[PDB]
PDB file of C-alpha atoms in Angstrom:
ATOM      1  CA  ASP A   1      30.701  81.425 125.626  1.00 12.22           C
ATOM      2  CA  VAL A   2      29.679  77.715 125.607  1.00 11.24           C
ATOM      3  CA  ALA A   3      26.240  78.868 124.021  1.00 13.70           C
ATOM      4  CA  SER A   4      27.761  81.040 121.290  1.00  8.42           C
ATOM      5  CA  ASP A   5      31.010  78.984 121.001  1.00  8.88           C
ATOM      6  CA  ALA A   6      28.843  75.795 120.450  1.00 12.88           C
ATOM      7  CA  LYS A   7      26.729  77.643 117.865  1.00 10.51           C
ATOM      8  CA  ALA A   8      29.830  79.010 116.115  1.00  8.94           C
ATOM      9  CA  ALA A   9      31.168  75.413 116.180  1.00  6.42           C
ATOM     10  CA  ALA A  10      28.060  73.909 114.403  1.00  4.70           C
ATOM     11  CA  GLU A  11      28.184  76.802 111.945  1.00  7.88           C
ATOM     12  CA  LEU A  12      31.962  76.406 111.180  1.00  5.97           C
ATOM     13  CA  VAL A  13      31.211  72.604 110.659  1.00  8.24           C
ATOM     14  CA  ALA A  14      28.375  73.594 108.293  1.00  5.69           C
ATOM     15  CA  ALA A  15      30.734  75.882 106.163  1.00  3.31           C
ATOM     16  CA  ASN A  16      33.273  73.109 106.351  1.00  2.00           C
ATOM     17  CA  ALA A  17      30.714  70.532 105.103  1.00  3.01           C
ATOM     18  CA  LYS A  18      30.261  72.686 101.955  1.00  2.00           C
ATOM     19  CA  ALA A  19      33.899  73.724 101.417  1.00  2.00           C
ATOM     20  CA  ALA A  20      34.779  69.952 101.840  1.00  2.00           C
ATOM     21  CA  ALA A  21      32.159  68.881  99.409  1.00  2.00           C
ATOM     22  CA  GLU A  22      33.362  71.515  97.037  1.00  2.00           C
ATOM     23  CA  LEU A  23      37.015  70.383  97.471  1.00  2.00           C
ATOM     24  CA  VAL A  24      35.649  66.805  96.909  1.00  2.00           C
ATOM     25  CA  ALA A  25      34.328  68.070  93.557  1.00  2.00           C
ATOM     26  CA  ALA A  26      37.654  69.698  92.674  1.00  3.51           C
ATOM     27  CA  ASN A  27      39.377  66.280  93.923  1.00  4.82           C
ATOM     28  CA  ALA A  28      36.844  64.438  91.558  1.00  5.31           C
ATOM     29  CA  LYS A  29      37.993  66.682  88.645  1.00  2.61           C
ATOM     30  CA  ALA A  30      41.775  66.618  89.517  1.00  4.03           C
ATOM     31  CA  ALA A  31      41.687  62.754  89.935  1.00  4.33           C
ATOM     32  CA  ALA A  32      39.772  62.146  86.601  1.00  2.00           C
ATOM     33  CA  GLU A  33      42.258  64.648  85.109  1.00  2.00           C
ATOM     34  CA  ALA A  34      45.159  62.787  86.591  1.00  2.00           C
ATOM     35  CA  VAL A  35      43.633  59.491  85.096  1.00  2.00           C
ATOM     36  CA  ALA A  36      43.397  61.133  81.624  1.00  2.00           C
ATOM     37  CA  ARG A  37      47.024  62.606  82.152  1.00  2.00           C
TER      38      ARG A  37
END
């Protein structure tokens, strides 16, 4: 419900914020790698 749905929405975005920053780290690697390559 809007109480739990809103909670879950903020939580999802918290998980996303990590997974995104973690993907940004992989992207930093993969770009630096692509530069060297």
